[PDB]
Symmetry: C3
Subunit: 416 residues, 3 copies
């Protein structure tokens, strides 16, 4: 074989009923043909698996345990299942289409057990031993979790962002992975990648999923670029933990994730030049000694949800949280724009001054030239007693920077 596979032209199995069995069957063939690891300076180059545009049901989890496997399609096929499930059911046979399309993988797996959301993943990338599994590519296909289900919260089942399904789950240490041009829709978790080195997530459309991008465990020298991201109110849009040298740029993050970016103990990383829009506070969270990070030239918009099916759904956080919350040392917050739109009548807790940037802990945080435009009075910067020895420049007037001048360097934005 020439290492080129098409799921519609594989003899064993049929991809309409179960594309999981088909791809696993292909992976078996690749391992059979690529047994030896050092023959003429080569051995296991891997292979490419092609999904033509189509509606493929996946009933078996795809296990990927080989390096250099590309899975490509010919279309991300996103349509807004959220909108359609909220359209009256009578009007459905008049709609031009109902379901997502492209090269579509329908995740027909049940929810996973105790700490086993991995068991409900369409694609599981896992391997033990050395070296790190490397250069697996997912390109330009659709992954659909189809329906959200009742969570006992009382809301309409299709608006819970709950089904125990994952698009792609990478369990093992990985080097040089790529997720590009994908479409993820209607999954509790779109993309969960543990232990990622030199990972690239470029130019995906990841929307109407509970959580979109979670980089878990740890990682190094990775980048999340040029994505369109929208999550649900109990989940993360972009999340990373214990990462170093992460680059988060050029993303357009829209609602309705709890956060837009959420870092737990992330260091020496850069969250710069993204468009961020949420309907709740707590848009960007640097937590648990997230230190020496650059947060720069981003555009923040926080406003009220206008779409009436989610009117009065929130993420549990009040306006004193801040749009940018920082618990950690020596970060750099430079050149950001913040737009705060809130109605004075509905500011929680009653009658507080909403806060934009908040330093809850740590020291040496540099905050310079940030511009806040708000329809109400705001605390541009709020430095808790738990944080000290911070420099805060041109980010508000003396009224707008609430902080103890004894232990912090402040310059007020000139006025009048």
């Amino acid at each position: 074989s020439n290492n080129r596979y098409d799921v519609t032209e594989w003899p064993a199995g049929n991809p309409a009923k179960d594309i999981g069995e088909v791809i696993n069957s292909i992976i078996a063939d690749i391992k059979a043909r690529q047994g030896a690891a050092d023959v003429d300076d080569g051995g296991k180059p891997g292979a490419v698996i092609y999904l033509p545009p189509g509606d493929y049901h996946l009933r078996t989890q795809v296990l990927i345990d080989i390096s250099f496997l590309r899975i490509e399609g010919s279309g991300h096929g996103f349509t807004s299942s959220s909108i359609r499930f909220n359209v009256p059911e009578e009007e459905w046979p008049d709609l031009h289409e109902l379901w997502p399309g492209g090269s579509r993988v329908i995740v027909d797996l049940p929810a996973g057990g105790a700490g086993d959301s991995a068991a409900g993943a369409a694609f599981l990338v896992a391997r033990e031993g050395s070296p790190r599994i490397s250069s697996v590519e997912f390109s330009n296909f659709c992954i659909d979790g189809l329906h959200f289900t009742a969570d006992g919260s009382g809301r309409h089942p299709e608006n819970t962002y709950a089904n125990g399904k994952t698009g792609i789950h990478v369990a093992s240490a990985n080097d040089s992975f790529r997720v590009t041009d994908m479409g993820f829709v209607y999954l509790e978790n779109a993309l969960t990648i543990h232990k990622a080195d030199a990972l690239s997530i470029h130019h995906n459309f990841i929307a109407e999923c509970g959580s979109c991008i979670e980089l878990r465990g740890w990682g190094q020298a990775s980048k999340i670029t040029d994505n369109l991201v929208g999550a649900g109110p109990r989940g993360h849009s972009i999340y990373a933990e214990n990462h170093g040298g992460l680059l988060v740029t050029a993303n357009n993050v829209f609602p309705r994730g709890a956060s837009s970016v959420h870092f737990k103990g992330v260091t020496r990383s850069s969250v710069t030049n993204n468009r961020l829009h949420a309907f709740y506070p707590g848009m960007v969270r640097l937590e648990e000694n997230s230190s020496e990070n650059l947060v720069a030239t981003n555009h923040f918009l926080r406003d009220h949800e206008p779409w009436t099916p989610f009117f009065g759904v929130d993420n549990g956080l009040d306006d004193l949280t801040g749009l940018l919350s920082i618990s950690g040392n020596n970060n750099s917050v430079i050149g950001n724009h913040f737009s705060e739109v809130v109605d004075a009548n509905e500011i929680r807790p009653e009658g507080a001054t909403p806060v934009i940037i908040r330093l809850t802990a740590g020291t040496g945080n540099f905050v310079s030239t940030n511009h806040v435009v708000s329809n109400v009075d705001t605390q541009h910067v709020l430095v808790d007693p738990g944080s000290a020895r911070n420099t805060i420049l041109d980010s508000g007037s003396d009224t707008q920077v609430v902080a103890d001048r004894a232990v912090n360097a402040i310059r007020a934005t000139p006025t009048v």
Copy 2:
């Protein structure tokens, strides 16, 4: 069928004479085979249409009225038709190539009627009713308008930037569209997309077209990233109207569009980190209550046209226009570099001080740490009487910031 089409292997029609008829014939086949919208949790996944590298004439407009249609090629095939048409005609048979290449669609349509430039579009994406037409992809092919024609302006016909031809025209509301890796050349309009939600224009080469990117009507949460853009002096390089949450980054915009970026009533968007180069003033225009936008870390160069066929062609605007013109409220202009190269002898109007940043209207505009390097004296910032209550920091000395100190906060850049 497996929803995979190749224009060179379609029985009905021949793509050398008319690829328009061929693709429309394919679209008819897709609609025939994908009638039902809800069969086994699916129905109309769409399809992919492949253009091998070749010279294809298009004589019929391609109408796209289905979601999830990908049209892909294998090469953007840009060569500079402008350069070649200005090379002496005697030398033409010595040139290695003459025409553009790649997967080439030659637009052989006549110009459109009154308000109907849409009729001269090679690709028309239009549909009525719900939902929004979604996830149409144009990838890695060439669209050539072949020749520019006489406009009665007296200039050489091939330098008018005038033929009534459009590359791609999207008329209807659309969600999750993509234009990637394309080559557009020698069209009056390269890419015109009305009413665009979550649109992505990543990594295209869009040059020697009258106007390149126009986002018209309205739109939300879209992004124009990583493009190489060059327009003509009566047209737009990047234009958007009535957009929210637009992200314009990582573009290299070269001459010779009138503007590099032009916003009409665009809000809460970000034009950051682009390289911008024009031969005229008015490089970036925020007009008609373009408000709460971030303009950051861009590199502006304005200089004289050196290429002698366009020597003394301009866009009608004088040096008092400004490089960055702002008419709107609460924008953020941070960290930009401006290089102004003009000859003192040819500054229009005679003997004026050229202006870099200009605030013609609105209030609350924040302008901090911008650096201007000019071979002459310049008005780094000019605040008209019509604009007030702006903050202007470290963007010039007191001489260089022309503004009424009573109603604006100014800090001069320290000196000497």
Copy 3:
């Protein structure tokens, strides 16, 4: 033919033994079939050459002398050959894979002569005469130089970063070229492009090569975006000379190149919003009248090498060099973050204060709002006597900005 070629389905030659002969044979066929340059408004559209995933040996240099040639694969196949060659040899038969994969081109060429590293290039793009060779595309395949060899330096042969092999070498003036989604590994030079106009290097993985990206001779309006880059200590990560309008963004440059970015006489370009990490000083060098450049919102980390096989390897430069060295006029250094981790016991020369930003020559350089976090005392900015008339704002306290106040405008970062 339809201009579509597959290296595994070409009759003349076999790509396992010599893919160079196969591709050159294909190029001969394309020139044979595309003789005429103006037939029905077309002539030489070019072609696409496909490499399925596989282990292909290249023994003949591929000469590309036609416009619009795409060479595509289906996988970048990077694995870390550096790690594996430093793993004990006994453990090798237990490793899951050894070699890189994807669509793999193994460079089996010997080293080149005097000033002829071009002779050891797998892919040579060269043409004389007009117009500029245009829109050649390299996409999503692997280029492997296989082994590094003894350089007489005493270090292990596989750690010398020395074999005289180049991945892709472009010798001639070129317009609208693309290198996207590639994997380069174990080459002395990954990508060397002379005389490049409107070049795009988007989304490549270029690691464990002596030098990765060199833009040589001259060039205009090009961009290096969204790459993962790692070089060797005698070479360049990103290098450009005599370029204008270069855009370097969204890159994650990791060790162990001498520099992360190195400019020789580069003007009116932008190095903004990259993550930069080196184990040595001299991370970003603007040299030989590199002027009017924007260096903005980047994240710099300099620390000690932790990997014991390269412990005590360096690039020859001392801590007085600076992380950002500037020799040229009117540059803009805005919004950068710098993390300096050094052990006081090993600061060369003995007991000096390490410098972060250094201005060795030129005038009018604007340096505003830069934040330095260091485990030791540092010279945040050092202005040599050879540089004067610079503005330096909020980039350190008066102690931390070493400069002559008579001929430079300084504002200290407020304190305490």
